[PDB]
Design a protein around this motif. Structure first.
Motif, PDB file in Angstrom:
ATOM      1  N   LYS A  34     -15.157  -4.453   4.831  1.00  0.00           N
ATOM      2  CA  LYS A  34     -15.083  -5.895   4.787  1.00  0.00           C
ATOM      3  C   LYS A  34     -15.560  -6.443   3.436  1.00  0.00           C
ATOM      4  O   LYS A  34     -16.141  -7.541   3.371  1.00  0.00           O
ATOM      5  CB  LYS A  34     -15.856  -6.517   5.949  1.00  0.00           C
ATOM      6  CG  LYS A  34     -17.304  -6.120   6.039  1.00  0.00           C
ATOM      7  CD  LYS A  34     -18.027  -7.042   7.045  1.00  0.00           C
ATOM      8  CE  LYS A  34     -19.512  -6.769   7.085  1.00  0.00           C
ATOM      9  NZ  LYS A  34     -20.217  -7.629   8.089  1.00  0.00           N
TER      10      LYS A  34
ATOM     11  N   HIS B 224     -12.013   1.194   7.148  1.00  0.00           N
ATOM     12  CA  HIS B 224     -11.838  -0.225   6.830  1.00  0.00           C
ATOM     13  C   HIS B 224     -13.144  -0.840   6.351  1.00  0.00           C
ATOM     14  O   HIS B 224     -14.171  -0.692   7.009  1.00  0.00           O
ATOM     15  CB  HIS B 224     -11.361  -0.981   8.065  1.00  0.00           C
ATOM     16  CG  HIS B 224     -10.022  -0.544   8.562  1.00  0.00           C
ATOM     17  ND1 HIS B 224      -9.669  -0.609   9.894  1.00  0.00           N
ATOM     18  CD2 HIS B 224      -8.948  -0.039   7.917  1.00  0.00           C
ATOM     19  CE1 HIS B 224      -8.434  -0.165  10.042  1.00  0.00           C
ATOM     20  NE2 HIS B 224      -7.969   0.183   8.856  1.00  0.00           N
TER      21      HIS B 224
ATOM     22  N   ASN C 143      -6.696  -4.673   1.896  1.00  0.00           N
ATOM     23  CA  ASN C 143      -6.424  -4.777   3.316  1.00  0.00           C
ATOM     24  C   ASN C 143      -6.555  -6.222   3.790  1.00  0.00           C
ATOM     25  O   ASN C 143      -7.086  -6.487   4.865  1.00  0.00           O
ATOM     26  CB  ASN C 143      -7.367  -3.878   4.123  1.00  0.00           C
ATOM     27  CG  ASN C 143      -6.949  -3.770   5.597  1.00  0.00           C
ATOM     28  OD1 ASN C 143      -5.767  -3.742   5.901  1.00  0.00           O
ATOM     29  ND2 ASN C 143      -7.915  -3.705   6.505  1.00  0.00           N
TER      30      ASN C 143
ATOM     31  N   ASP D 162     -15.769  -2.636   8.317  1.00  0.00           N
ATOM     32  CA  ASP D 162     -15.074  -3.715   8.994  1.00  0.00           C
ATOM     33  C   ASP D 162     -14.913  -3.348  10.462  1.00  0.00           C
ATOM     34  O   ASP D 162     -13.794  -3.206  10.949  1.00  0.00           O
ATOM     35  CB  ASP D 162     -13.704  -3.908   8.336  1.00  0.00           C
ATOM     36  CG  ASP D 162     -13.085  -5.252   8.627  1.00  0.00           C
ATOM     37  OD1 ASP D 162     -13.603  -5.987   9.500  1.00  0.00           O
ATOM     38  OD2 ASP D 162     -12.059  -5.569   7.981  1.00  0.00           O
TER      39      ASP D 162
ATOM     40  N   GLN E  14     -17.857   6.946   5.916  1.00  0.00           N
ATOM     41  CA  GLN E  14     -17.816   5.857   6.901  1.00  0.00           C
ATOM     42  C   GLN E  14     -19.211   5.496   7.431  1.00  0.00           C
ATOM     43  O   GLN E  14     -19.581   4.315   7.522  1.00  0.00           O
ATOM     44  CB  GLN E  14     -16.848   6.203   8.040  1.00  0.00           C
ATOM     45  CG  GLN E  14     -16.761   5.142   9.129  1.00  0.00           C
ATOM     46  CD  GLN E  14     -15.518   5.287   9.993  1.00  0.00           C
ATOM     47  OE1 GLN E  14     -14.401   4.975   9.559  1.00  0.00           O
ATOM     48  NE2 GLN E  14     -15.699   5.770  11.209  1.00  0.00           N
TER      49      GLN E  14
ATOM     50  N   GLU F 280     -11.370  -4.517  -2.627  1.00  0.00           N
ATOM     51  CA  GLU F 280     -11.172  -3.163  -3.141  1.00  0.00           C
ATOM     52  C   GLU F 280     -11.984  -2.794  -4.401  1.00  0.00           C
ATOM     53  O   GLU F 280     -12.509  -1.675  -4.481  1.00  0.00           O
ATOM     54  CB  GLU F 280      -9.672  -2.862  -3.294  1.00  0.00           C
ATOM     55  CG  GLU F 280      -8.936  -3.779  -4.223  1.00  0.00           C
ATOM     56  CD  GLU F 280      -8.337  -4.980  -3.520  1.00  0.00           C
ATOM     57  OE1 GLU F 280      -8.793  -5.327  -2.404  1.00  0.00           O
ATOM     58  OE2 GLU F 280      -7.409  -5.589  -4.101  1.00  0.00           O
TER      59      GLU F 280
ATOM     60  N   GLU G 113      -8.069   6.060   8.432  1.00  0.00           N
ATOM     61  CA  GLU G 113      -8.318   4.962   7.510  1.00  0.00           C
ATOM     62  C   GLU G 113      -9.767   4.562   7.703  1.00  0.00           C
ATOM     63  O   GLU G 113     -10.269   4.600   8.824  1.00  0.00           O
ATOM     64  CB  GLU G 113      -7.432   3.752   7.849  1.00  0.00           C
ATOM     65  CG  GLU G 113      -5.935   3.933   7.645  1.00  0.00           C
ATOM     66  CD  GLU G 113      -5.135   2.669   7.978  1.00  0.00           C
ATOM     67  OE1 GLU G 113      -5.726   1.652   8.403  1.00  0.00           O
ATOM     68  OE2 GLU G 113      -3.901   2.682   7.827  1.00  0.00           O
TER      69      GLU G 113
ATOM     70  N   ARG H  11     -10.999  -7.820   1.955  1.00  0.00           N
ATOM     71  CA  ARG H  11     -11.070  -6.567   2.693  1.00  0.00           C
ATOM     72  C   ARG H  11     -10.328  -5.452   1.973  1.00  0.00           C
ATOM     73  O   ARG H  11      -9.488  -5.704   1.119  1.00  0.00           O
ATOM     74  CB  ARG H  11     -10.486  -6.742   4.102  1.00  0.00           C
ATOM     75  CG  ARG H  11     -11.357  -7.600   5.022  1.00  0.00           C
ATOM     76  CD  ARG H  11     -10.614  -7.968   6.276  1.00  0.00           C
ATOM     77  NE  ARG H  11      -9.424  -8.719   5.932  1.00  0.00           N
ATOM     78  CZ  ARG H  11      -8.532  -9.155   6.815  1.00  0.00           C
ATOM     79  NH1 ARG H  11      -8.694  -8.905   8.108  1.00  0.00           N
ATOM     80  NH2 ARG H  11      -7.471  -9.838   6.405  1.00  0.00           N
ATOM     81  N   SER H  12     -10.652  -4.212   2.312  1.00  0.00           N
ATOM     82  CA  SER H  12     -10.008  -3.072   1.683  1.00  0.00           C
ATOM     83  C   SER H  12     -10.092  -1.894   2.639  1.00  0.00           C
ATOM     84  O   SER H  12     -10.775  -1.970   3.664  1.00  0.00           O
ATOM     85  CB  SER H  12     -10.702  -2.745   0.342  1.00  0.00           C
ATOM     86  OG  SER H  12     -12.098  -2.556   0.520  1.00  0.00           O
ATOM     87  N   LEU H  13      -9.391  -0.815   2.322  1.00  0.00           N
ATOM     88  CA  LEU H  13      -9.462   0.388   3.144  1.00  0.00           C
ATOM     89  C   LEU H  13      -9.423   1.622   2.261  1.00  0.00           C
ATOM     90  O   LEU H  13      -9.052   1.547   1.082  1.00  0.00           O
ATOM     91  CB  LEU H  13      -8.355   0.408   4.206  1.00  0.00           C
ATOM     92  CG  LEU H  13      -6.895   0.389   3.760  1.00  0.00           C
ATOM     93  CD1 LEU H  13      -6.453   1.799   3.406  1.00  0.00           C
ATOM     94  CD2 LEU H  13      -6.013  -0.150   4.885  1.00  0.00           C
TER      95      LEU H  13
ATOM     96  N   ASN I  42       0.802  -1.221   0.000  1.00  0.00           N
ATOM     97  CA  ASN I  42       0.000   0.000   0.000  1.00  0.00           C
ATOM     98  C   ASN I  42       0.841   1.280   0.000  1.00  0.00           C
ATOM     99  O   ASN I  42       0.444   2.293  -0.605  1.00  0.00           O
ATOM    100  CB  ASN I  42      -0.973   0.012   1.190  1.00  0.00           C
ATOM    101  CG  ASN I  42      -2.088  -1.030   1.057  1.00  0.00           C
ATOM    102  OD1 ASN I  42      -2.235  -1.674   0.018  1.00  0.00           O
ATOM    103  ND2 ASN I  42      -2.880  -1.183   2.105  1.00  0.00           N
TER     104      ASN I  42
END
Length: 119
Positions: free
Chosen positions: A24, A22, A82, A119, A109, A27, A20, A86-88, A4
């Motif tokens: 679940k 997060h 992530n 997540d 968010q 990406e 960040e 998962r991704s962020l 990253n």
């Protein structure tokens, strides 16, 4: 696949916010949803939205009704891996207000949580 910290080099000059978000979901799915979300959120006070899925970046401008001084916040958002499934999200402030850009992050968010993908 590159880390990253290397992917983040795709951001323009600016201040990468420490925060960040997060997710679940992976990406590509997160990015597609963010694209749909923001393109349909001009009423937030968003202009000049540009989408690029190949680099997972969204660019745009947070505006406002300042009559004398330009007070818009130019920003970039990047979606990063992530872990499996998962991704962020990272935010880059090119100009303007860190608080304003952070407000956007917070609103995103909140939407992710309501959609059950945080997540």
């Amino acid at each position: 696949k590159p880390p990253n910290s290397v992917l983040l080099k795709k951001f323009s000059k600016g201040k990468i916010l420490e925060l960040e978000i997060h997710a679940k979901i992976p990406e590509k799915r997160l990015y597609e949803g963010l694209h749909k979300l923001l393109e349909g959120w001009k009423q937030y006070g968003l202009k000049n939205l540009v989408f690029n899925i190949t680099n997972m970046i969204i660019t745009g401008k947070l505006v406002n009704d300042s009559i004398l001084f330009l007070r818009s916040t130019l920003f970039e958002i990047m979606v990063l891996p992530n872990g499996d499934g998962r991704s962020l999200i990272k935010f880059n402030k090119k100009t303007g207000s860190t608080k304003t850009l952070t407000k956007l992050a917070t609103e995103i968010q909140i939407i992710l949580q309501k959609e059950g993908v945080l997540d």
